[PDB]
Design an enzyme around this catalytic site. Structure first.
Site, short mmCIF file in Angstrom:
data_model
loop_
_atom_site.label_atom_id
_atom_site.label_comp_id
_atom_site.label_asym_id
_atom_site.label_seq_id
_atom_site.Cartn_x
_atom_site.Cartn_y
_atom_site.Cartn_z
N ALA A 73 0.81 -1.21 0.00
CA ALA A 73 0.00 0.00 0.00
C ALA A 73 0.85 1.26 0.00
CB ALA A 73 -0.92 0.00 1.21
N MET B 52 3.70 6.18 -1.64
CA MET B 52 2.94 6.98 -0.68
C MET B 52 2.94 8.47 -1.01
SD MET B 52 0.77 6.75 1.34
CE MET B 52 0.91 8.43 1.96
N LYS C 45 -1.99 11.09 -5.94
CA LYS C 45 -2.94 11.19 -7.03
C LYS C 45 -3.25 9.83 -7.68
CE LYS C 45 -2.67 16.08 -8.09
NZ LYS C 45 -2.99 17.05 -9.18
#
Ligand SMILES: [Mg+2]
Ligand SMILES: [Mg+2]
Lengths: 263, 263
Positions: A41, A45, A49
């Site tokens: 994830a 970072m 956008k």
């Protein structure tokens, strides 16, 4: 000397582990039987956008799973219709992680009583901050000033955002301010402005740990991981690095007593 | 130094043994009455074209039989009908032979972990490679790029296909790429390309064994069989010779530390 501290937001002031922008990205996918690690994830970072939902869609193990559940690869309207609901779900989840990081309270209160001004910089945006701040204040935290990448001509690595907390707060040399963050980008910011750069660990993005997952971590492994963060800060700048926040008002004196010059 | 690895498509990544074409050649013949062995089915292989069926046609023993069944020898029509169906039964069976060879996953899993690109080349054709790729994805293997004899003005002997991967993966000096294969041709290609060639054995065409035969074979017998393959590869320029897949990485350390130069 050192009349103002320029704090950061998620990872420093609020949102332990800097998970807000993450959780969202996970749901968007998990909402299509994909499942991804918070570990994946992060990565792109900074710069939240659409391109991140495209870099996360071009990731190996990710493109795989996706192609196995829908029997095809992500479309162009797949990145869209996903990012369109990133902003959405995020602006509605940000306030969930806007509580001043435990103990940060006393630190700010204290630092003010000693005549210190409090400013800040961030990766987020106005629209993203107009949500974050608002909740923070209603929750006990509200610096004297704030700046987002929207106010200057460039983002986090550059010192621009920091050169404005200055103007506002009104503080002549830069050596009179302290930069505090939780990411290598932050150290690059402070050690660019000409400020005193310090890195927080316990709750930083780098250490990427949860406010509990740090207690379950065993005595030897945690510290073991803390040093990894610490060392990574030091070389990218960091004149100092600290685990908790209580240690900052301990750094100021040092700066003053120590008597070393920022070059 | 080793920025990307170019894998082969039938013998290295999927098909442990490379029987896809074989177990199709011997079906077209077993359906007309004249049975044949997979051993005979693969004299020359990189030439899956029509005259391959023609070579199993003018092959004594096989010329015999068929004549003793059709009371006559093959004709130009008997062939261009076995081929005009060879590929039709191929596209239906290829998916049955398009899944990884275990290690390939874990390894390709890593590699990308150290940030190494992953491309490929093949003898199979565009249409043949299609389907295979699609099924390989649903299984757990999606290289970054793929090239077939249809994209370049020639086949495997020539570097062409490998040059295409470079442009795509954006890794410029050939010698900064590894070339894994499974047959004499795969080595001819990697050497001509100008990269670091490596040939695998266990599960290759040059070993024509099965992931059950290699487990049901004598300790001495098998070792002997491998050496024939090994000596084979080396005799064709293979800079290295790995047995299975794990050791593909140790090869990279070796190459990066043995300060050697190609050509
Ligand atoms: Mg932060
Ligand atoms: Mg092959």
């Amino acid at each position: 000397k050192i009349e103002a501290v320029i704090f950061d937001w998620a990872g420093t002031t609020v949102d332990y582990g800097c998970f807000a922008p993450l959780e969202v990205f996970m749901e968007i996918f998990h909402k299509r039987g994909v499942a991804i690690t918070a570990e994946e994830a992060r990565k792109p970072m900074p710069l939240l956008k659409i391109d991140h939902v495209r870099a996360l869609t071009e990731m190996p193990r990710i493109a795989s799973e996706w192609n196995r559940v829908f029997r095809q690869l992500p479309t162009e309207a797949d990145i869209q219709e996903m990012y369109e609901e990133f902003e959405e779900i995020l602006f509605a989840i940000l306030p969930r992680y806007a509580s001043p990081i435990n103990a940060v309270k006393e630190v700010i209160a204290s630092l003010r009583e000693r005549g210190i001004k409090i400013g800040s910089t961030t990766g987020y945006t106005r629209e993203m901050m107009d949500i974050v701040a608002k909740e923070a204040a209603l929750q006990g935290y509200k610096p004297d000033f704030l700046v987002t990448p929207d106010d200057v001509p460039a983002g986090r690595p550059y010192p621009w955002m920091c050169y404005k907390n200055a103007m506002e707060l009104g503080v002549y040399p830069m050596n009179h301010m302290i930069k505090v963050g939780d990411t290598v980008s932050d150290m690059k910011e402070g050690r660019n402005a000409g400020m005193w750069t310090v890195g927080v660990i316990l709750g930083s993005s780098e250490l990427g740990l949860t406010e509990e997952e740090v207690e379950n971590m065993d005595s030897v492994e945690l510290r073991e991981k803390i040093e990894v963060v610490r060392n990574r800060f030091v070389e990218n700048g960091a004149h100092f690095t600290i685990e908790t926040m209580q240690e900052l008002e301990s750094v100021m004196e040092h700066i003053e007593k120590q008597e070393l010059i920022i070059s």
